[PDB]
Amino acid sequence: LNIYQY
Amino acid sequence: LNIYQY
Amino acid sequence: LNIYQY
Amino acid sequence: LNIYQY
Amino acid sequence: LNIYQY
Amino acid sequence: LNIYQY
Amino acid sequence: LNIYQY
Amino acid sequence: LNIYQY
Amino acid sequence: LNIYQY
Amino acid sequence: LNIYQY
Amino acid sequence: LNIYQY
Amino acid sequence: LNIYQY
Amino acid sequence: LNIYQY
Amino acid sequence: LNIYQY
Amino acid sequence: LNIYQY
Amino acid sequence: LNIYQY
Amino acid sequence: LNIYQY
Amino acid sequence: LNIYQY
């Protein structure tokens, strides 16, 4: 699980 | 699961 | 689990 | 678990 | 567990 | 457990 | 447990 | 346990 | 246990 | 200029 | 200029 | 200029 | 200039 | 200039 | 200038 | 100038 | 100038 | 000038 939140 | 949120 | 929050 | 919060 | 909080 | 709080 | 608080 | 508090 | 308090 | 490279 | 490199 | 490099 | 390097 | 290097 | 080096 | 070196 | 070296 | 060296 990789989560990138910008 | 890869999630990219811009 | 990698979480990046900007 | 790696968490980066900016 | 690595947590980076800026 | 490594915690960095700025 | 390493804790860095600035 | 290492704790750094600034 | 090492504690640094500034 | 927005560049997304995966 | 925003650059995202994965 | 924002640069994200993973 | 913000640079994030992982 | 903010630089984050992991 | 803020520099974080891990 | 703030420099954090781990 | 603040310098933290671990 | 604050210098912390561990």
Side-chain angles (χ1 to χ4, degrees):
Chain A
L1 184 47
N2 298 113
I3 295 170
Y4 310 84
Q5 289 192 140
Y6 303 91
Chain B
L1 184 47
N2 298 113
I3 295 170
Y4 310 84
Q5 289 192 140
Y6 303 91
Chain C
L1 184 47
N2 298 113
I3 295 170
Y4 310 84
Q5 289 192 140
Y6 303 91
Chain D
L1 184 47
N2 298 113
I3 295 170
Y4 310 84
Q5 289 192 140
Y6 303 91
Chain E
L1 184 47
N2 298 113
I3 295 170
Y4 310 84
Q5 289 192 140
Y6 303 91
Chain F
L1 184 47
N2 298 113
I3 295 170
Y4 310 84
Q5 289 192 140
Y6 303 91
Chain G
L1 184 47
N2 298 113
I3 295 170
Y4 310 84
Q5 289 192 140
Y6 303 91
Chain H
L1 184 47
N2 298 113
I3 295 170
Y4 310 84
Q5 289 192 140
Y6 303 91
Chain I
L1 184 47
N2 298 113
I3 295 170
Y4 310 84
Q5 289 192 140
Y6 303 91
Chain J
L1 184 47
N2 298 113
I3 295 170
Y4 310 84
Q5 289 192 140
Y6 303 91
Chain K
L1 184 47
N2 298 113
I3 295 170
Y4 310 84
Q5 289 192 140
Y6 303 91
Chain L
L1 184 47
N2 298 113
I3 295 170
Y4 310 84
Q5 289 192 140
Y6 303 91
Chain M
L1 184 47
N2 298 113
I3 295 170
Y4 310 84
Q5 289 192 140
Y6 303 91
Chain N
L1 184 47
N2 298 113
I3 295 170
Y4 310 84
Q5 289 192 140
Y6 303 91
Chain O
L1 184 47
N2 298 113
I3 295 170
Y4 310 84
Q5 289 192 140
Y6 303 91
Chain P
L1 184 47
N2 298 113
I3 295 170
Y4 310 84
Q5 289 192 140
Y6 303 91
Chain Q
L1 184 47
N2 298 113
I3 295 170
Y4 310 84
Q5 289 192 140
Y6 303 91
Chain R
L1 184 47
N2 298 113
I3 295 170
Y4 310 84
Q5 289 192 140
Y6 303 91

